């Protein structure tokens, strides 16, 4: 299943749902009266997360679902100094 993530730039960020449920609030956003049980779009809009940070959090979703159990080498996540501050705030907001 695929869910959409909308930034403040309008960038849709379609991500497989099982990877996108690692963050707590995206699980919470799709819960309650935001389920929309028709399986047509299944989108959540972030009014205060820029696109250059949703890209990083989606890359982290894929990275974490890939390396959740492979405790072999666990390669480091590449975080630029420019992206470092807003990425922390986004992970805090999403409980990522």
């Amino acid at each position: 299943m695929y869910v959409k993530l909308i930034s403040s730039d309008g960038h849709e960020f379609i991500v497989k749902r099982e990877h996108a449920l690692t963050s707590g609030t995206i699980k919470a956003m799709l819960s309650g009266p935001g389920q929309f049980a028709e399986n047509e779009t299944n989108e959540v809009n972030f009014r205060e997360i820029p696109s250059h940070v949703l890209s990083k959090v989606c890359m982290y979703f894929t990275y974490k679902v890939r390396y959740t159990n492979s405790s072999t080498e666990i390669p480091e996540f590449p975080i630029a100094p420019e992206i470092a501050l807003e990425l922390l705030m986004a992970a805090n907001f999403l409980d990522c």
Binding site: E12, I14, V15, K16, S55
Partner: peptide, 16 residues
């Protein structure tokens, strides 16, 4: 192999 499909604004994170 992981891909980032890129439209005008749409982006899909696929795993082939």
């Amino acid at each position: 192999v992981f891909l980032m499909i890129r439209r005008h604004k749409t982006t899909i994170f696929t795993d082939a």
